[PDB]
Every structure is written in structure tokens, then in C-alpha cells.
Amino acid sequence: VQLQESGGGLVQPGGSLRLSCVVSGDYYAIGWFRQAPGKEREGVAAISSRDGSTYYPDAVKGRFTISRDNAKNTVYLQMNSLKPEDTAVYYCAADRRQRWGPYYYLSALEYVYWGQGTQVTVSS
Amino acid sequence: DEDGLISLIFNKKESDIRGQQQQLVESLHKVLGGHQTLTVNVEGVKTKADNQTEVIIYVVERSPNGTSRRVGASALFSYFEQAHIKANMQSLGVTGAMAQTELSPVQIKQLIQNPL
């Protein structure tokens, strides 16, 4: 399965950004992951293709929302009330292994298919 | 899939898991029905965070002719995700589970068409 992200940019604190990723191929799980300079990849949102359940770390709850338009084979990450701590390269990733629980939905280690990433920078 | 490996995340410290591993393994055996034709094996134990531990297991099943083999990972995962079984697992401290088998597109399509 292939992934290609778009929608990154330079954002003011409190602002919004909407990321998109066009997906080709079937998957069990898809999510968004971010990696700040010199840091590890961390999951910020995931969704199950089987039951549509979604998963987020507390740090982005109420601010980030993952959704899909299956007609367009596109997944989205709507990011509101952005903060400088949200600055990172954001990646879409997918996987075909069954799982349940937030840990395995949000762990970057458990996704095999990766997009190229799109830069998100939040500064005044 | 034939290797039958299921990863489980526990909301328990590694020292607690290892300290009571006999009991943990038997409780998993009980969740499976407790018959002598099934044996739970621990493949590995790894700390993931202060109070999070991953335990990788597989289950050996014996046939009436004395032959043994591992329960396939997809089959074992399917059992553990059933609502009644998941609840029992959560009572043991399990907060997540994963199989290693990368499903085919047709398998994935089937799961989406029949999520239950």
C-alpha cells in the first residue's frame, strides 16, 4: 500500500492546518505520526478500517481529528489550536496486522507502510 | 501465521509480570477453556514503560492422534478479540493485543464487509 501526504505549512499559534493523504491499497489500520527534529516518531491519530474506531494521545485530544473520505481514498488530519510543541514532520502510515487497543494503534513501530512526510511548523 | 505469535500489552510492571509468570500463563490457559489439549507458551517479555509490559505468546494445540502444532495467529487473535474473551483479558491487565500476520487484501476486504 502506497501513501503520499500533503497540507503541511507554516502556522501561527492558535491556527489550523488540514493534512491529506491519498492511499492506494487495503489496510487494517491507518494513522498519522509525527517526528520533531532529532526525536522519535510518535503517533498522534489512528483509525480502524474494520469498525472506524479512532485513537489519540491525550496531548492532541479535542484538537486533532482523523477522518476518511473512502470515495476519494483519502484520509485527513484536521489540526486545530496548533501550538509550537506541534512542530514536526507529519507522516501518514498504514498496516495490515490486526490489533486492538490504543498502544498498538498509536505505536509507529507497528506500521510497515510509510508516506514521505509533510512539514508542519508552528511559530509566531 | 503458522508461528502463532500474539503480542499482549499489560498495564503491569515487568517485574510483576515475571514475578508471577506461572500464574499469568495459567490464567491465559483458563481464558482459552483450560483443556489439556492447549498449552500457552511465553515467547518473550519486554518492558515498554514504567507500568507497561509486552508479553508475546503462542498456543500449542494437540490432536487426538498425539500430533502437536501451534494455533495460527489469526485464529488465536480472533478468539481473544471476541467481546467476552476481551473482557476476561482486560481483567488480567491486558490493554491491547496484536498479531504479526500481514493480512491479504481479500482478507482485509472480508473483515471490512463483516466487521463482526
Contact A93, A30 (CB under 8 A): yes
Window 23-82 of B: residues touching A by CB (8 A cutoff) are 48, 52, 74, 77, 81
Do B1 and B74 touch, CB atoms closer than 8 A?
yes
Contact (CB<8Å) B108/A103: no
Technique employed here was: X-ray
Per-domain boundaries in chain B: 1-116
Please check whether residue A58 is in contact with residue A106, taking contact to mean a CB–CB distance below 8 angstroms: no
Q: Do A104 and B48 touch (CB under 8 A)?
A: no
Q: Is B72 helix (H, G, I), strand (E, B) or coil?
A: coil
Breaks in chain B (C to N over 2.5 Å), named by the residue before each, are none
* Contact predicate B73/B5, CB 8 Å: yes
CB atoms within 10 A of CB A20: 16
Q: Which residue of B52, B77, B109 is in closest CB contact with A98?
A: B77
Cell output for B70: 501451534
d(CA A98, CA A82): 32
Using an 8 Å CB-CB cutoff, list chain B residues near A43. Answer: none
Set of chain A residues whose Cβ sits within 8 Å of the Cβ of B89:
none
- Which residues is A92 bridged to in the sheet? A32
Rounded CA separation B112/B116 (Å): 9
Question: Residue for cell digits 508471577?
Answer: B20
Cβ-Cβ pairs closer than 8 A, A with B, add up to 60
Domains, chain A, ordered by start: 1-124 (2.60.40.10)
CB contact (8 A) between residue B99 and residue A103: no
Q: Which residues are within 8 A (CB) of A3 and not within 5 positions of it... i.e. 6 or more apart?
A: A21, A22, A23, A92, A93, A94, A113, A114, A115, A116
| Cell of residue B86, nine digits | 476481551
**H or E stretch at A38:** none
Determine, for residues A26 and B109 on separate chains, whether the beta-carbon distance falls below 8 Å. Answer: yes
How many Cα atoms sit within 13 Å of A4 on the Cβ side? 3
Residue with cell 498495564: B11
The CA dihedral of A107, A110, B14, A39, to the nearest 10 degrees, is -50
Q: What resolution in angstrom units was achieved for this structure?
A: 1.5
Rounded-to-integer distance, Cα B87 and Cα B94, Å: 9
Find cell 500476520 and name the residue: B101
State how far the Cα of A70 lies from the Cα of A28, in Å rounded to an integer.
Answer: 14
Between the two ends of chain A, the Cα-to-Cα distance in Å is: 37
The CA-to-CA distance between both ends of chain B, in Å, stands at 21
Does the distance separating the beta carbons of A98 and B101 come in below 8 Å? yes
Q: Give, as one character, the DSSP assignment of residue B92.
A: T
String of DSSP letters for B7-42: EEEESS-HHHHHHTHHHHHHHHHHHTT--TTEEEEE
User: Helix, strand or coil for residue A85?
Assistant: helix
**Are the CB atoms for A22 and A4 separated by under 8 Å?**
yes
DSSP result, A65-82: EEEEEGGGTEEEEEE-S-
Contacts with B111 from chain A: Cβ below 8 Å? 28, 49-50
Residue of B nearest to A24 (CA): B105
As a residue count, chain B comes to 116
Among B77, B18, B94, B68, CA closest to A96: B77
